[PDB]
Protein backbone atom coordinates (compact mmCIF):
# COMPACT_ATOMS: atom_id res chain seq x y z
CA UNK A 1 0.00 0.00 0.00
CA UNK A 2 1.02 3.62 -0.65
CA UNK A 3 0.37 6.70 1.50
CA UNK A 4 -1.74 9.50 -0.02
CA UNK A 5 0.09 12.47 -1.55
CA UNK A 6 0.94 15.15 0.98
CA UNK A 7 1.20 18.87 0.31
CA UNK A 8 4.62 20.37 1.00
CA UNK A 9 4.57 23.90 2.38
CA UNK A 10 6.38 25.84 5.07
CA UNK A 11 3.49 28.22 5.65
CA UNK A 12 1.10 25.92 7.50
CA UNK A 13 -7.29 18.31 -4.12
CA UNK A 14 -9.64 19.14 -7.00
CA UNK A 15 -10.33 16.24 -9.39
CA UNK A 16 -8.14 13.77 -7.51
CA UNK A 17 -9.57 10.45 -6.28
CA UNK A 18 -7.54 8.58 -3.58
CA UNK A 19 -9.52 5.39 -4.35
CA UNK A 20 -7.76 4.97 -7.70
CA UNK A 21 -4.19 3.57 -7.82
CA UNK A 22 -2.81 6.29 -10.15
CA UNK A 23 -0.57 8.94 -8.57
CA UNK A 24 -1.70 12.52 -8.00
CA UNK A 25 0.67 13.52 -10.80
CA UNK A 26 -0.97 11.05 -13.21
CA UNK A 27 -4.57 11.71 -12.19
CA UNK A 28 -4.31 15.49 -12.03
CA UNK A 29 -2.19 16.33 -15.08
CA UNK A 30 -1.79 15.63 -18.77
CA UNK A 31 1.89 15.17 -19.60
CA UNK A 32 2.70 17.01 -22.84
CA UNK A 33 6.50 16.97 -23.17
CA UNK A 34 9.70 16.56 -21.18
CA UNK A 35 11.56 19.87 -20.83
CA UNK A 36 14.60 18.53 -19.01
CA UNK A 37 16.18 15.65 -17.15
CA UNK A 38 19.29 15.18 -15.04
CA UNK A 39 20.40 14.41 -11.50
CA UNK A 40 18.20 17.29 -10.32
CA UNK A 41 15.12 15.47 -11.57
CA UNK A 42 12.79 15.52 -14.58
CA UNK A 43 10.75 18.51 -15.71
CA UNK A 44 7.53 18.12 -17.69
CA UNK A 45 5.31 20.52 -19.57
CA UNK A 46 1.80 19.60 -18.38
CA UNK A 47 -1.79 20.72 -18.58
CA UNK A 48 -3.74 20.83 -15.33
CA UNK A 49 -7.03 18.96 -15.02
CA UNK A 50 -8.06 21.39 -12.30
CA UNK A 51 -8.01 24.61 -14.35
CA UNK A 52 -7.08 23.55 -17.89
CA UNK A 53 -3.96 25.71 -17.87
CA UNK A 54 -0.37 24.84 -18.79
CA UNK A 55 2.29 24.39 -16.10
CA UNK A 56 5.70 22.89 -15.53
CA UNK A 57 6.23 20.10 -12.99
CA UNK A 58 9.61 19.05 -11.61
CA UNK A 59 9.85 15.69 -9.90
CA UNK A 60 12.85 14.18 -8.16
CA UNK A 61 14.53 11.10 -9.65
CA UNK A 62 14.60 8.71 -6.70
CA UNK A 63 12.74 8.19 -3.39
CA UNK A 64 14.09 9.91 -0.25
CA UNK A 65 16.96 7.90 1.22
CA UNK A 66 16.36 8.97 4.83
CA UNK A 67 14.93 11.80 6.94
CA UNK A 68 17.82 14.21 6.26
CA UNK A 69 17.71 13.62 2.50
CA UNK A 70 13.97 14.32 2.63
CA UNK A 71 14.44 17.46 4.72
CA UNK A 72 17.09 18.79 2.34
CA UNK A 73 14.96 18.14 -0.72
CA UNK A 74 11.81 19.64 0.82
CA UNK A 75 13.80 22.75 1.79
CA UNK A 76 13.65 23.82 -1.88
CA UNK A 77 9.92 24.39 -1.46
CA UNK A 78 10.45 26.60 1.60
CA UNK A 79 12.95 28.73 -0.28
CA UNK A 80 10.71 28.95 -3.33
CA UNK A 81 7.77 29.97 -1.13
CA UNK A 82 9.91 32.79 0.30
CA UNK A 83 10.34 34.12 -3.25
CA UNK A 84 6.58 34.05 -3.74
CA UNK A 85 5.04 36.09 -6.56
CA UNK A 86 7.14 38.36 -8.77
CA UNK A 87 6.98 38.90 -12.55
CA UNK A 88 10.69 38.10 -12.96
CA UNK A 89 10.76 35.01 -10.73
CA UNK A 90 9.45 31.54 -11.57
CA UNK A 91 6.20 31.24 -9.59
CA UNK A 92 5.51 28.12 -7.51
CA UNK A 93 1.88 26.97 -7.72
CA UNK A 94 2.00 23.98 -5.36
CA UNK A 95 4.31 21.22 -4.21
CA UNK A 96 3.65 17.74 -2.89
CA UNK A 97 5.31 14.46 -2.02
CA UNK A 98 4.13 11.00 -3.05
CA UNK A 99 5.96 7.66 -3.03
CA UNK A 100 9.05 9.37 -1.61
CA UNK A 101 9.17 11.63 -4.69
CA UNK A 102 9.02 15.45 -4.50
CA UNK A 103 6.97 17.40 -7.06
CA UNK A 104 7.09 21.16 -7.69
CA UNK A 105 4.41 22.61 -9.97
CA UNK A 106 5.24 26.05 -11.31
CA UNK A 107 4.08 28.40 -13.99
CA UNK A 108 5.21 27.30 -17.45
CA UNK A 109 8.08 29.32 -18.84
CA UNK A 110 9.96 29.27 -22.13
CA UNK A 111 13.46 27.94 -22.88
CA UNK A 112 16.37 28.85 -20.62
CA UNK A 113 18.75 31.60 -21.71
CA UNK A 114 21.28 28.85 -22.28
CA UNK A 115 18.96 27.09 -24.72
CA UNK A 116 17.97 30.37 -26.38
CA UNK A 117 21.62 31.24 -26.97
CA UNK A 118 22.46 27.74 -28.20
CA UNK A 119 19.76 27.89 -30.88
CA UNK A 120 20.12 31.51 -31.92
CA UNK A 121 25.13 36.38 -31.48
CA UNK A 122 22.09 37.74 -29.60
CA UNK A 123 20.98 41.26 -30.55
CA UNK A 124 21.96 43.55 -27.68
CA UNK A 125 18.44 44.94 -27.32
CA UNK A 126 17.40 41.46 -26.15
CA UNK A 127 20.38 41.20 -23.81
CA UNK A 128 19.48 44.53 -22.16
CA UNK A 129 16.00 43.13 -21.50
CA UNK A 130 17.32 39.97 -19.87
CA UNK A 131 19.73 41.98 -17.74
CA UNK A 132 16.98 44.34 -16.58
CA UNK A 133 14.47 41.59 -15.79
CA UNK A 134 16.97 39.49 -13.88
CA UNK A 135 18.14 42.60 -11.99
CA UNK A 136 14.50 43.15 -10.93
CA UNK A 137 14.52 39.53 -9.72
CA UNK A 138 17.67 40.11 -7.66
CA UNK A 139 16.24 43.29 -6.16
CA UNK A 140 13.22 41.23 -5.16
CA UNK A 141 15.30 38.38 -3.69
CA UNK A 142 17.44 40.76 -1.68
CA UNK A 143 14.33 42.43 -0.22
CA UNK A 144 13.31 39.01 1.09
CA UNK A 145 16.75 38.54 2.64
CA UNK A 146 17.66 36.01 -0.06
CA UNK A 147 20.74 35.46 -2.23
CA UNK A 148 20.81 33.22 -5.29
CA UNK A 149 24.08 31.33 -5.40
CA UNK A 150 23.65 29.84 -8.87
CA UNK A 151 22.59 32.61 -11.26
CA UNK A 152 23.57 31.33 -14.72
CA UNK A 153 22.05 31.12 -18.23
CA UNK A 154 20.49 27.71 -17.53
CA UNK A 155 18.56 29.14 -14.56
CA UNK A 156 16.91 32.06 -16.34
CA UNK A 157 13.79 31.26 -18.40
CA UNK A 158 12.27 33.31 -21.19
CA UNK A 159 8.74 34.68 -21.14
CA UNK A 160 6.36 36.91 -23.14
CA UNK A 161 7.80 39.68 -25.32
CA UNK A 162 11.46 39.66 -24.29
CA UNK A 163 10.78 38.98 -20.61
CA UNK A 164 12.64 36.46 -18.48
CA UNK A 165 12.35 34.89 -15.06
CA UNK A 166 14.93 33.62 -12.58
CA UNK A 167 14.40 30.11 -11.17
CA UNK A 168 16.02 27.12 -9.43
CA UNK A 169 15.63 28.38 -5.88
CA UNK A 170 17.13 25.35 -4.17
CA UNK A 171 20.37 27.32 -4.51
CA UNK A 172 19.00 30.24 -2.49
CA UNK A 173 20.53 31.15 0.86
CA UNK A 174 19.20 33.49 3.53
CA UNK A 175 20.89 36.50 5.08
CA UNK A 176 21.16 27.30 5.33
CA UNK A 177 22.59 24.27 3.56
CA UNK A 178 23.40 24.88 -0.10
CA UNK A 179 25.03 23.02 -2.99
CA UNK A 180 27.94 24.32 -5.07
CA UNK A 181 27.21 26.96 -7.72
CA UNK A 182 28.79 26.83 -11.18
CA UNK A 183 32.40 28.02 -10.80
CA UNK A 184 32.23 29.86 -14.11
CA UNK A 185 29.87 32.47 -12.61
CA UNK A 186 30.99 32.47 -8.99
CA UNK A 187 31.78 35.75 -7.21
CA UNK A 188 35.40 35.78 -6.01
CA UNK A 189 34.49 36.31 -2.36
CA UNK A 190 32.68 32.95 -2.29
CA UNK A 191 36.12 31.26 -2.36
CA UNK A 192 36.39 32.36 1.26
CA UNK A 193 32.80 31.36 1.98
CA UNK A 194 31.81 35.01 2.05
CA UNK A 195 28.47 35.96 0.54
CA UNK A 196 25.89 38.72 0.50
CA UNK A 197 23.56 40.53 -1.86
CA UNK A 198 26.58 41.41 -4.00
CA UNK A 199 27.33 37.81 -4.94
CA UNK A 200 24.44 37.23 -7.33
CA UNK A 201 24.99 40.65 -8.93
CA UNK A 202 28.46 39.40 -9.88
CA UNK A 203 27.08 36.08 -11.16
CA UNK A 204 24.50 37.92 -13.24
CA UNK A 205 27.30 40.06 -14.69
CA UNK A 206 29.16 37.00 -15.97
CA UNK A 207 25.87 35.40 -17.06
CA UNK A 208 25.07 38.37 -19.25
CA UNK A 209 28.68 38.60 -20.43
CA UNK A 210 28.55 34.99 -21.59
CA UNK A 211 25.25 35.32 -23.43
CA UNK A 212 26.26 38.64 -25.01
CA UNK A 213 29.62 37.41 -26.34
CA UNK A 214 28.64 33.76 -26.96
CA UNK A 215 31.92 32.42 -25.57
CA UNK A 216 32.56 29.84 -22.84
CA UNK A 217 33.82 31.32 -19.56
CA UNK A 218 36.73 29.60 -17.76
CA UNK A 219 35.93 27.30 -14.85
CA UNK A 220 39.32 27.88 -13.19
CA UNK A 221 42.95 28.80 -13.75
CA UNK A 222 44.42 32.10 -14.92
CA UNK A 223 41.44 32.87 -17.14
CA UNK A 224 39.12 32.56 -14.14
CA UNK A 225 41.29 34.94 -12.14
CA UNK A 226 41.54 37.45 -14.96
CA UNK A 227 37.75 37.91 -15.07
CA UNK A 228 37.88 38.82 -11.38
CA UNK A 229 40.30 41.77 -11.53
CA UNK A 230 37.94 44.63 -12.37
CA UNK A 231 38.34 44.79 -16.15
CA UNK A 232 36.93 42.88 -19.13
CA UNK A 233 39.48 40.82 -21.05
CA UNK A 234 39.30 41.79 -24.76
CA UNK A 235 38.70 38.10 -25.50
CA UNK A 236 35.09 38.55 -24.38
CA UNK A 237 34.26 42.08 -25.55
CA UNK A 238 34.26 41.78 -29.34
CA UNK A 239 31.03 43.33 -30.58
CA UNK A 240 29.85 44.48 -27.15
CA UNK A 241 28.68 48.11 -27.09
CA UNK A 242 30.48 50.65 -24.92
CA UNK A 243 27.26 51.01 -22.92
CA UNK A 244 26.93 47.31 -22.17
CA UNK A 245 30.61 46.96 -21.27
CA UNK A 246 30.40 49.79 -18.75
CA UNK A 247 27.43 48.28 -16.92
CA UNK A 248 29.02 44.83 -16.86
CA UNK A 249 32.20 46.23 -15.34
CA UNK A 250 30.11 47.81 -12.58
CA UNK A 251 28.69 44.36 -11.85
CA UNK A 252 32.06 42.62 -12.01
CA UNK A 253 33.85 44.74 -9.39
CA UNK A 254 35.86 42.15 -7.38
CA UNK A 255 35.38 43.89 -4.02
CA UNK A 256 31.81 43.14 -2.95
CA UNK A 257 31.78 46.30 -0.80
CA UNK A 258 32.34 48.39 -3.93
CA UNK A 259 30.21 46.37 -6.33
CA UNK A 260 27.04 48.03 -7.68
CA UNK A 261 23.74 47.06 -6.04
CA UNK A 262 20.82 45.75 -8.08
CA UNK A 263 18.85 48.89 -7.28
CA UNK A 264 21.73 51.18 -8.23
CA UNK A 265 21.98 49.41 -11.57
CA UNK A 266 18.23 49.60 -12.15
CA UNK A 267 18.44 53.37 -11.50
CA UNK A 268 20.83 53.90 -14.41
CA UNK A 269 19.39 55.87 -17.35
CA UNK A 270 20.33 53.00 -19.67
CA UNK A 271 18.15 50.55 -17.72
CA UNK A 272 15.03 52.71 -17.55
CA UNK A 273 11.78 50.81 -18.14
C1 LIG B 1 9.34 22.94 -12.82
C2 LIG B 1 10.25 23.90 -12.01
C3 LIG B 1 10.20 23.91 -10.62
C4 LIG B 1 11.01 24.80 -9.88
C5 LIG B 1 11.90 25.67 -10.54
O6 LIG B 1 12.75 26.58 -9.79
C7 LIG B 1 11.97 25.67 -11.93
C8 LIG B 1 12.94 26.63 -12.62
C9 LIG B 1 11.14 24.79 -12.66
C10 LIG B 1 11.29 24.76 -14.17
C11 LIG B 1 12.42 24.06 -14.62
C12 LIG B 1 12.67 23.95 -15.99
C13 LIG B 1 13.94 23.23 -16.46
C14 LIG B 1 14.08 22.72 -17.78
C15 LIG B 1 15.29 22.12 -18.12
N16 LIG B 1 16.31 22.05 -17.22
C17 LIG B 1 16.23 22.53 -15.99
N18 LIG B 1 17.38 22.43 -15.15
C19 LIG B 1 17.20 22.55 -13.73
C20 LIG B 1 17.62 23.93 -13.19
C21 LIG B 1 19.14 24.09 -13.22
N22 LIG B 1 19.71 23.99 -14.53
C23 LIG B 1 19.83 22.64 -14.99
C24 LIG B 1 18.64 22.26 -15.87
C25 LIG B 1 15.05 23.16 -15.55
C26 LIG B 1 11.81 24.56 -16.92
C27 LIG B 1 10.69 25.25 -16.45
C28 LIG B 1 9.75 25.89 -17.50
N29 LIG B 1 10.23 26.01 -18.81
O30 LIG B 1 8.65 26.28 -17.19
C31 LIG B 1 10.41 25.36 -15.08
N32 LIG B 1 9.27 26.08 -14.62
Report CA(43)–ligand 1 centroid distance (Å).
6
The method recorded for this entry reads X-ray
Is 150 annotated in the active site?
yes
If one counts every other C-beta atom within 10 angstroms of the C-beta of residue 262, the result is 23
Report CA(30)–ligand 1 centroid distance (Å).
18
201 plus 78 within the same structural domain: no
Using the 3D structure, point to which of 82, 107, 132 is the last residue of a domain. Answer: 107
Using CB atoms within 10 A of its CB, is residue 177 exposed (0-12), middle (13-18) or buried (19+)?
Answer: exposed
73 plus 122 within the same structural domain: no
Report CA(244)–ligand 1 centroid distance (Å).
28
74 plus 132 within the same structural domain: no
Q: What is the DSSP string of 72-98?
A: HHHHHHHHHHHH-S-TTBPPEEEEEEE
- Ligand 1 closest atom vs CA 40: 19
Question: Cα angle vertex 65, ends 60, 68, to 5°?
Answer: 95
Using the 3D structure, point to which of 84, 107, 130 is the last residue of a domain. Answer: 107
- Closest Cα to atom 6 of ligand 1: 168
Closest CA to 46 of 136, 109, 108, 1: 108
Using the 3D structure, point to which of 107, 127, 142 is the last residue of a domain. Answer: 107
14 plus 88 within the same structural domain: yes
> What is the best residue among 34, 168, 178, 185 to mutate for testing ligand 1's pocket, by most ligand atoms within 8 Å of CB?
168
Number of domains into which the chain is organized: 2
If one counts every other C-beta atom within 10 angstroms of the C-beta of residue 75, the result is 17
Region of 199 on the Ramachandran plot (φ > 0 left; ψ -120 to 50 alpha; else beta): alpha
Is any ligand 1 atom within 6 A of the Cβ of residue 166?
Answer: no
Is any ligand 1 atom within 6 A of the Cβ of residue 83?
Answer: no
Residue 1 inside a domain? The answer is no
Q: What is the DSSP string of 105-128?
A: EEE----BHHHHHHT----HHHHH
Structural domain span for residue 80: 6-107
| Alpha-carbon distances of 81 from 64, 91, 114, 164, rounded to whole Å | 21, 9, 25, 19
149 plus 260 within the same structural domain: yes
Residue 247 inside a domain? The answer is yes
Domain harbouring 233, CATH code: 1.10.510.10
- Ligand 1 closest atom vs CA 41: 19
122 plus 240 within the same structural domain: yes
Q: Which of 51, 69, 150, 182 is catalytic?
A: 150
126 plus 235 within the same structural domain: yes
Residues 54 and 140: their CA atoms lie apart, in Å, by 25
Amino acid sequence: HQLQPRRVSFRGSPGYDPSRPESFFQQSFQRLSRLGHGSYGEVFKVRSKEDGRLYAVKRSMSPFRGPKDRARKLAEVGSHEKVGQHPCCVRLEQAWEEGGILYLQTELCGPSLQQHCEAWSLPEAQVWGYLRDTLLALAHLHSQGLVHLDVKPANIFLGPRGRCKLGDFGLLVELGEVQEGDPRYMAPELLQGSYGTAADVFSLGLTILEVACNMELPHGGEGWQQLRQGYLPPEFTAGLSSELRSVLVMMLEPDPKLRATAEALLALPVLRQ
